[PDB]
């Protein structure tokens, strides 16, 4: 009952994966497709 | 409709001005509405 599907969700968003989100990535979540 | 609107939403939903986000911030940026 922990962090597992919000985990796969937070990694599925992340580009190269040191572990964090930045203001430059966040627009590309609300846009990128292809 | 451009990245200044995206810039005001990360600055609206943030408070302490950690202009980079960790997985904490993720849990409340999703559902930290009361």
UniProtKB/Swiss-Prot annotation, chain B:
Ca(2+) 4 binds at residues 14, 16, 18, 20, 25. It comes from the Eukaryota. Residues 1-34 form the EF-hand domain. Belongs to the troponin C family. Troponin is the central regulatory protein of striated muscle contraction. Tn consists of three components: Tn-I which is the inhibitor of actomyosin ATPase, Tn-T which contains the binding site for tropomyosin and Tn-C. The binding of calcium to Tn-C abolishes the inhibitory action of Tn on actin filaments. Skeletal muscle troponin C binds four calcium ions. This is Troponin C, skeletal muscle. It comes from Gallus gallus. The lineage of its organism: Eukaryota, Metazoa, Chordata, Craniata, Vertebrata. The gene is TNNC2. The chain holds residues 130 to 163 of 163 of the full protein.
């Amino acid at each position: 009952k922990s962090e597992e599907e919000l985990a796969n969700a937070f990694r599925i968003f992340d580009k190269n994966a040191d572990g964090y989100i930045d203001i430059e990535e966040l627009g590309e979540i609300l846009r990128a497709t292809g | 409709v451009t990245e200044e609107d995206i810039e005001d939403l990360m600055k609206d939903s943030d408070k302490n001005n950690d202009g980079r986000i960790d997985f904490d911030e993720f849990l409340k940026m999703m559902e930290g509405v009361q």
